[PDB]
């Protein structure tokens, strides 16, 4: 599990139906870091410091053990900078 910051939302209209209706967010460890896309399982705004999970845990964190996710946001950190 790592700590990334939400940058912006990502919309992919022609995405596989296995992703459901879950939102997608562009996240990075810090501004300037490589960008990544995570499933928003919590609901957060850009600039939030969030907690992310990967591997097979990100699948069931996004709703189902068969969900096509390798990065999911599983919480917002109360105090981070």
């Amino acid at each position: 599990m790592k700590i990334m910051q939400v940058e912006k939302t990502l919309v992919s209209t022609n995405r596989i139906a296995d992703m459901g209706h879950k939102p997608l967010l562009v996240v990075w460890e810090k501004p300037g870091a490589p960008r990544q896309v995570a499933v928003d399982a919590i609901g957060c705004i850009p600039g939030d410091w969030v907690l992310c999970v990967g591997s097979s845990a990100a699948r069931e964190a996004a709703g189902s053990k068969s969900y096509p996710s390798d990065l999911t946001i599983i919480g917002i950190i109360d105090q981070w900078n």
């Binding site: 939302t9 919309v11 209209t13 209706h21 879950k22 939102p23 928003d40 609901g43 957060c44």
Partner: protein
Amino acid sequence: GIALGMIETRGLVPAIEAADAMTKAAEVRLVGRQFVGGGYVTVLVRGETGAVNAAVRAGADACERVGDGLVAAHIIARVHSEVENILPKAPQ
């Protein structure tokens, strides 16, 4: 954008949650919350067709499980000019 997405909920808490989900899902503008009467609240967002579609789907998924729940969730990509006279421009 000129696409329109609306979510009907029974009660205000699911409506606020749904509007939050749509606004955090894509680049849409919340243009009005309407108290229909009898416990119905409608939240309306505007934006591009893909953004509005994603926002409405995310809002429906989020607010399906809170309160009395979702009543309706509809997307109108092409809104007729006559319907724009009954659509709010800004919330209050």
